[PDB]
Coordinates of N, CA and C in Angstrom, one line a residue:
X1 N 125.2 133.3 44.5 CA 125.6 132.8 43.2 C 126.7 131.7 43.4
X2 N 126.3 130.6 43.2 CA 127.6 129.3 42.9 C 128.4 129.6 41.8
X3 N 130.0 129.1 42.9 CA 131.1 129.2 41.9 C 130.7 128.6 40.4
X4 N 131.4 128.7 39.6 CA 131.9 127.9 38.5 C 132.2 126.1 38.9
X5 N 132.5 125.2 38.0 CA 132.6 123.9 38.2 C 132.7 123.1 39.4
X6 N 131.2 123.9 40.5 CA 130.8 123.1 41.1 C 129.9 122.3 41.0
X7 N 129.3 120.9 41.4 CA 128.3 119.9 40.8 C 127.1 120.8 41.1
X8 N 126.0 120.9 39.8 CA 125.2 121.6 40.0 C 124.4 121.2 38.7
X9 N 123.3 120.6 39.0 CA 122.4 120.0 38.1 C 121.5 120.8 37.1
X10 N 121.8 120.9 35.7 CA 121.7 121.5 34.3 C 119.9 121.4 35.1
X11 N 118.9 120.2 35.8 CA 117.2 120.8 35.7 C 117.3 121.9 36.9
X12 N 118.8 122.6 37.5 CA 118.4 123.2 38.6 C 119.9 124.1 38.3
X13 N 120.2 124.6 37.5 CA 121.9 125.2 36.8 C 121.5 126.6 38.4
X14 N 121.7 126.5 39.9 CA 122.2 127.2 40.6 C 123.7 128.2 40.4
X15 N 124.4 128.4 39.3 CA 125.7 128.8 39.0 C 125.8 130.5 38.6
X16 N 126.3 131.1 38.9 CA 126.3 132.5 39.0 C 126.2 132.4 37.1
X17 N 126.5 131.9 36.5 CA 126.5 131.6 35.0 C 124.7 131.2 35.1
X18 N 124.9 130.5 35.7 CA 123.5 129.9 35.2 C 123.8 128.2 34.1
X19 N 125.3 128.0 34.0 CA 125.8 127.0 32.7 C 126.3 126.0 33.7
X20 N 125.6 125.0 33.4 CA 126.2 123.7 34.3 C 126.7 123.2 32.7
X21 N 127.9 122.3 32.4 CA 128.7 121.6 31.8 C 128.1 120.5 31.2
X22 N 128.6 119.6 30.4 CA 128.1 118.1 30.7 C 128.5 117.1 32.2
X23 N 129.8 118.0 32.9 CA 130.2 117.2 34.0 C 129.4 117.7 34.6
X24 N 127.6 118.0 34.9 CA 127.1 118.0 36.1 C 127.6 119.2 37.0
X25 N 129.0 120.1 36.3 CA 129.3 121.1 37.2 C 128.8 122.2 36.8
X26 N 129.0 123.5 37.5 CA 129.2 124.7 37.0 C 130.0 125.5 35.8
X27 N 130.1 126.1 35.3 CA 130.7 126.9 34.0 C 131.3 128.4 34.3

């Protein structure tokens, strides 16, 4: 699971959240 506000693309949200931002990061 990827940290939180790392770059992680909303067509591919890899984030333990699952929420990429509008900055292209993680949530």
């Amino acid at each position: 699971c990827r940290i939180p506000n790392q770059k992680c693309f909303q067509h591919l949200d890899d984030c333990c959240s699952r929420k990429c931002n509008r900055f292209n990061k993680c949530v």
